[PDB]
Every structure is written in C-alpha cells, then in structure tokens.
Design a binder for this molecule. Structure first.
Ligand SMILES: [Mg+2]
Lengths: 189, 56, 135, 64
RNA sequence: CCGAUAACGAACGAGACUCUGGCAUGCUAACUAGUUACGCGACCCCCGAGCGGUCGGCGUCCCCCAACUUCUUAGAGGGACAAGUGGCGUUCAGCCACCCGAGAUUGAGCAAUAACAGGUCUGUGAUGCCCUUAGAUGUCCGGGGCUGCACGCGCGCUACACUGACUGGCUCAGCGUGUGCCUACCCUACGCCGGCAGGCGCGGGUAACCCGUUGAACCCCAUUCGUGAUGGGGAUCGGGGAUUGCAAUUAUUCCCCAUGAACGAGGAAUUCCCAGUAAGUGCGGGUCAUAAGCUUGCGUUGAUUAAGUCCCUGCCCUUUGUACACACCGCC
C-alpha cells in the first residue's frame, strides 16, 4: 500500500533473526513513500532505532566531503540500486537490504585500553543497534571504494555490494571486514 | 574613569556607584533589582462571627 | 537535570505561602494569578517559577507539616499538645511493682509499708552487660 | 564440537565499564533456560529488553 | 539547593537579567507589505463548459472609487513552571520516562576576589623619564623598500575526479549596504555598441518606495566524456585588449587565445565538532581610487556517531605527604 519509490511493497519483508527486529524499520508502521524525512532522529538516544533503514542507508551513503548535503543525489542512487538488484535477483530490494544488514552486522568485536594482546585486551559482544550501524557503515564504505576509481557507477557498486552481503560470499567488503572483526575477537577471547 | 597627571606619571581612577532604587527615578533607576522580591503585607480579614445580612 | 530552584524563589515562595495560605491553591495558574498582586515580581519567568514552587510546597503542606509556618497547622499542634490530658492519669497505678532494694530505701526514708506497692521477686543471675568485643 | 550461537535478552543494565565508557555491563537472561541469567559486558548503545547473540556462552562476570 | 551544624547574620560571583529563535488564523495597525473578492483586459479551450485555467498585466487612499490582516512588518500582551501522570529518592532537595504542548536544555551578551613584570608608549592633544630638535629622529617632496629567495614552520584556497567535468534547460534565499563636515570616491534599472572585460545616453534611489519579487551557488533535469595525469588540476609562462590612478615595471585588477607542471587521498604526528550541528555551497559588511584565497555575518543542502568515562590532556572539592614558596620548568 505504501510502495516505497512507487513499488516494492514492504509488508512481505521478514527479518530472519529476532535480534534486530526491534531496530530494522521496514514494517508498515515505518513504511514511507520516499526515503527523505527531516524527522529529528538524532535529537534523543535510541531515536534512530525507529528511523527507517532505507533512510539510514541514504544518510550513511552521503560521505567524504564532496557529498555532505547531496541527499537528493543519494536518494536517486538508492533508487537506481534497488532497480538494479531487483533486476539481478528478482526478489524484494528491501528484503535484500535487510538480509545484507543481518549478514553484515558483526556479532562481536574487541575493545580495551591496556597492553594489547592482539588488538584489544577483551572480546566484547555488541548491541543490536551497533550491529545495524556497523552493517550500514560497512555496506556504504564497500560501495564507495568499489565505485571510486572504476567505470562501474556507484549505483551498480552499491547494488552488488548488497547482493553479495545478502548471501555471504566473501566478495563484499562488508562481510570481509565482519569476518576480520570476528576473528580478532575470537583471538582476543 | 579619569586620569591624574602626576609628576611621576599617570594615575588611573575608577569610581563605581550603585544607585539606590527609587520609584521617583530622579536619584536612581525606577525599576527594582531583577531578583528583588517584595511582598505586600496582608490584613487581618478574620471574620470570626456569625453570618449577617447588612442592608445598604 | 538543572531544574534546582534557588533561594530567590524558595524564600519568596515560603513567605507568600505563610502570608496568603488562604488565597493560594493547588492550581499553578491560579497561584501565578494571585502572585502579581500579592507580590511585586520584576520578571514573568521569576513569577511563574515562584508559582510552581508554591504549588509544590502546598502539595507538601496538605500532605504534611512542612517547616513553613501555617496558622491552621499551629492551632492543630497547639490543641494536640496543651490538651488530651487523659481522664485518668498515667501515674495513678493501683499497684507499683517495687524492687526489694527500693523497698529498703523507702523504709529508710520512712515511706515504707505502703498499701500500693507490690514487692517483685528479684532477678537471679546478674547477667547484664553486653559481651565484650566482637563475636 | 563448536558451540552453536544462542540468543539472550538483556534484563538489567549494571553500568558502564572499560574506563572509557565504551563498554556497558548488563545482566542477561538466556532463551533456552529463562532461569539462567549471567553478566556480560556489551559495546554500543544498549537498553534493557533487547536481545543479542552470544557467540561464546560464558566469558566473564564481575560486579562493578 | 535540602539538610545537618560553634556558628549567626550577610555580600559578590552562579542564577536571576538583556538581546535572540521557536507558537500565537487572539488585539492594534498598514498605497513605502500584502491577501481575498470584483471590474477591465491579454492568451488557451472553444466540442461546451465559462463561478474553466494563467497573468509579478491594468484598477478599486487617484478619495469615496471594495473589504480584511492569514501571509510581511512591529508594538502591547500571552505562553513553560519540572505544571500534570507513573517510578525512584531520607519520600526533602531533586532525577528518569510519558501525555498535552510551538517549545519540557535556542544561541549569545554581561560576568566575582586575587593576579601576570602577559600585549600595546606604532590609537590618542593618555603619559613620567631619557634621546633628538635646523645638515632634525620635526615636517614635506622624488625614487626605492616593506613582495626581495639554497631553506624550515603556521592559518588557508584549489585539487587529485564518473557520488565527477563540460554543455544547455529548469528552479529556489537571508543578513545587509548604497551619493560623503573635512572627503574628491555611492547602489544601480533600462536602451545602444562590443565576442569578453568594458564603453556610451537616459533615469530611480538619502531608501519596507530604486537596484530588488535581491531570478545566488550547491542541487535538479537532459547531452558529451569513459578510468588515461583524460574533457580531472590550472600552477608556470607568451602575446593581445580594457578598467582605476598623478603614476600599473618588481606584472593592481579584469578579459581573450595558447602551456597542462606537481598532484592518483598523503609517514611520524595533529585540529575542530553533538542537530539545522559538522561538512558541501554561494551571498552581504570591513578593508576598498583598484580590488579578497582573510575576517565578521547571512542564507541553501544536511548527515555518521554518542547521551558515556577519567584511559590520555587538563579543571574543581576533600583527605594526605613534602626538605617546594621565583612554589616540580621547584629543590637537590
Ligand atoms: Mg575542457
């Protein structure tokens, strides 16, 4: 009924794990016609949790100096990426994005200050909000260095980054960095 | 602020005076201090007797 | 955070409460409407802050005797202190349980052999004093 | 031989730790046994009621 | 602040205060701001609409020849107080969450005692002392210099590109300034010439009246480019044309045509920042005969992360040690 970008109904998208179903916001109460809303989502703690994850991807996809206000450009990038992944896979672009977030969120990391064993003294599991934040950041970063100095445009780079992340193939920077973080934490156990 | 030209040099004089409050305003500010709170004294208004009805 | 009131508002609130306890009420707007004529407040913000503290203090007063002076509370306390002498005293006991040593003291005083004294059996064991140190 | 991943819901937030505040320590209740609850330190914004994965079950518990 | 309490009663600072931003279809007011309605018009549809649609076209404070303040302006007022609910709390001071609300922490200004051999005598007809005072260290005039370059450092601007460059089209601001006591030098509409920088006539504005509905940039929509030191970058350098001035060389500035150098994201280090914020992006003022890579303001687009800690760098309070008191950059 809402049809983000005019298509891709939200109600069929299902989150496969209950760890992030309170922080992914694709359900009909958070379904919006367009990923652009000046919603003051940074005003209070945990307000970004109810922000739609397509809005989060749009906000985190606009980085590196040249692009700090070009939200309309980022919206068109996301729209083209959803078109490309729909043509390439056949399933819901929102479902692909949700699966990419789930498979990109690193279940644990390591953090401390003192004499480092390998990276940090302690291995610490992460919160679901940190999972979502890290996953979105990793996906956008991987798309950015995919699109930096090659003819393949940012839309296709984001598209195949999400495609690789939604399955798990070690071909996406997001899950490569996730595996690196997991190995570091396991060594720092 | 004034300067005094003494044989040894210049002497600086700074004078600050807090004007007293007055509603008249010809010796000081008309407004009171912002944090100054004044309360009017209540009267008795006891009325301890039986109810009455006075025709006027 | 950072909503602590200062002396400027607290003292003024207590003073106007103890002066106009009858006129004041538990309504913030009613209190801030009596403030303009019961007191001269240089600032609207100061006036409404004082009114809010007056509402808080009157809720506390109606739930209990706050240190702010109040004539109704004082007359109730007066009635509760300078009255309620019981019709029978607490010191007119029919029998007084008396220690034999105190009985000897009374006998030396010459007030021994009174009909209102019943001699208790003295305790045996001398087990007063708390055990010394811990454990 | 390796332990499978299992979920657990945060029941209480004890307080921050790590001496930079980067870690928050929580009391967390297992899904498979509700009577089982341990103390785990977690990083990132955490509020009570949300659920999280435990790649390894018991690591360390230490009251602040 | 509540509380204890050999203290009682005070004073400054903080707060309070002023400005600022957010709500007021509540009040007052508007031909130097408008809106609605109506009338002339201009164009499309005319199949037939017709109280159809567009007009920043003309009018209705031209005085009888419409009303009104929503929009704009600026005054008086209101409004928010931890006020209401739940929890925590010695059930105090208060804290957390929520409802209703424009707003439940908008940004600044002012800002104590005591100090520093901190900076300015190159701001002053503020100034002590010293120096000079007719071959002047006064003052004026001409020229040069303050730009000068094996090198090091700081604040910045431009970039390293395709989330882009070029070409065209579409489309949106707010601060704020504008003709001078000396003092000469203002902002500019429109028309014409020139390819551009500019030039030539006609005006308007001492200003909510004119520039100006400030047609800004970024952005948006299409074209070409295609991963190359390439249509990225525009330093260096040659020739030519204007503008200011008394004077442009050591190029004032601007315009045009050529040259496309390093630069492919930057070591060790290090700065700033929590919401309309950082950042991208242009526009005003100051400097200004000529002019901004500076600075002070304004608007446009608009996030990632965090609601914690004392780990590093520091600050405040209490206890404690001291061989320090120029006070650990000490002392020895
Ligand atoms: Mg070119």
């Amino acid at each position: 009924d809402i049809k983000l970008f005019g298509k891709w109904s939200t109600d069929d998208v299902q989150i496969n794990d209950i760890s992030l179903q309170d922080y992914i916001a694709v359900k009909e109460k958070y379904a919006k016609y367009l990923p652009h809303s000046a919603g003051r989502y940074a005003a209070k703690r945990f307000r970004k949790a109810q922000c739609p994850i397509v809005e989060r991807l749009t906000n985190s996809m606009m980085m590196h100096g040249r692009n700090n206000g070009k939200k309309l450009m980022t919206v068109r990038i996301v729209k083209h990426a959803f078109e490309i992944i729909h043509l390439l896979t056949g399933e819901n672009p929102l479902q692909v994005l949700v699966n990419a977030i789930i498979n990109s969120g690193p279940r644990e990391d390591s953090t401390r200050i003192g004499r480092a064993g390998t990276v940090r003294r302690q291995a610490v599991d992460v919160s679901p909000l940190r999972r979502v934040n890290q996953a979105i950041w990793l996906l956008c970063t991987g798309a950015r260095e995919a699109a930096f100095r090659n003819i393949k445009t940012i839309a296709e780079c984001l598209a195949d980054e999400l495609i690789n992340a939604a399955k798990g193939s070690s071909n996406s920077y997001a899950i490569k960095k996730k595996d690196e973080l997991e190995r570091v934490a396991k060594s720092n156990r | 602020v004034r300067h005094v030209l003494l044989r040894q040099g210049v002497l600086g004089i700074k004078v600050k005076i807090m004007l007293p409050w007055d509603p008249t305003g010809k010796i000081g500010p008309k407004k009171p201090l912002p944090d100054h709170v004044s309360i009017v004294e209540p009267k008795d208004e006891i009325l301890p007797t039986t109810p009455i009805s006075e025709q006027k | 955070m950072g909503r602590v009131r200062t002396k400027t508002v607290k003292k003024a609130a207590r003073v106007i409460i103890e002066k106009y306890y009858t006129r004041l009420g538990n309504d913030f707007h009613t209190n801030k409407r009596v403030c303009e004529e019961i007191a001269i407040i240089p600032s609207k913000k100061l006036r409404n802050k004082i009114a809010g503290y007056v509402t808080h203090l009157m809720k506390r007063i109606q739930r209990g005797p706050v240190r702010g002076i109040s004539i109704k509370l004082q007359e109730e306390e007066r009635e509760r202190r300078d009255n309620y002498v019981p019709e029978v005293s607490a010191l007119d006991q029919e029998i007084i349980e008396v220690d034999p040593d105190t009985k000897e003291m009374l006998k030396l005083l010459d007030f021994g052999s009174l009909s209102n004294l019943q001699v208790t059996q003295p305790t045996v064991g001398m087990n007063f004093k708390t055990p010394r140190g811990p454990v | 031989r390796v332990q499978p991943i299992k979920l657990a819901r945060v029941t209480k937030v004890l307080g921050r730790t790590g001496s930079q505040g980067q870690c928050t320590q929580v009391r967390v209740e297992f899904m498979d046994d509700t009577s089982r609850s341990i103390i785990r330190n977690v990083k990132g914004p955490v509020r009570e009621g949300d659920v999280l994965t435990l790649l390894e079950s018991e690591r360390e518990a230490r009251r602040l």
